């Protein structure tokens, strides 16, 4: 493993802890959610993110954050606001962007000196 892969795996593990039922663990299929592919053109999930860390597909934390935001935005686009999926996506997006905030990333960058 590389230092970037270890940092991204840490962020991913802490994010997955916020989803204990594993609603974001695997891609959303049309069988579980009718007409999903008709609405969501750029799907994302924690598993695909985990595969991208392992394959070393992320060049920066910004790219990782963009995939995390895409996953949450997709759930908020497809699901109505009073649903379990929309509420969880909104909660985790907020929590994730605090964890990987510019403030927290600057403190980590300063500790790499």
Query: Cα separation of 41 and 44, whole Å?
Result: 10
Q: Which stretch binds ligand 5TU (CB under 6 A): 8-16, 52-60, 78-86, 94-102?
A: 78-86
> If DSSP codes are grouped into helix, strand and coil, which group holds residue 90?
helix
- Specify the residue, 4 or 40, whose C-beta has the smaller distance to ligand 5TU: 40
From 110, 73, 109, select the one nearest 93 (Cα to Cα): 73
Q: What is the dihedral of CA 81, 85, 90, 92, to 10 degrees?
A: 170
- Count of residues interacting with ligand 5TU (CB under 6 A): 9
Q: Which two tokens stand for residue 105?
A: 């990333």
Q: Is 78 near ligand 5TU (CB under 6 A)?
A: yes
User: Least distance from C-beta 85 to ligand 5TU, angstroms?
Assistant: 4
Residues found near ligand 5TU in the complex (CB under 6 A): 23-24, 28, 32-33, 75, 78-79, 85
């Amino acid at each position: 493993s590389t230092p970037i892969q270890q940092l991204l795996e840490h962020f991913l593990r802490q994010l997955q802890r916020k989803d204990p039922h594993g609603f974001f663990a695997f891609p959303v299929t049309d069988a579980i959610a009718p007409g999903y592919s008709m609405i969501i053109k750029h799907p994302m999930d924690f598993g695909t993110m985990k595969d991208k860390i392992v394959a070393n597909e992320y060049k920066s934390v910004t790219e990782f954050k963009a995939d995390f935001k895409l996953m949450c935005d997709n759930a908020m686009t497809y699901n109505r606001p009073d649903t379990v999926y929309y509420k969880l996506a909104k909660k985790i997006l907020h929590a994730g962007f605090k964890m990987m905030s510019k403030e927290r990333l600057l403190a980590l960058k300063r500790s790499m000196s």
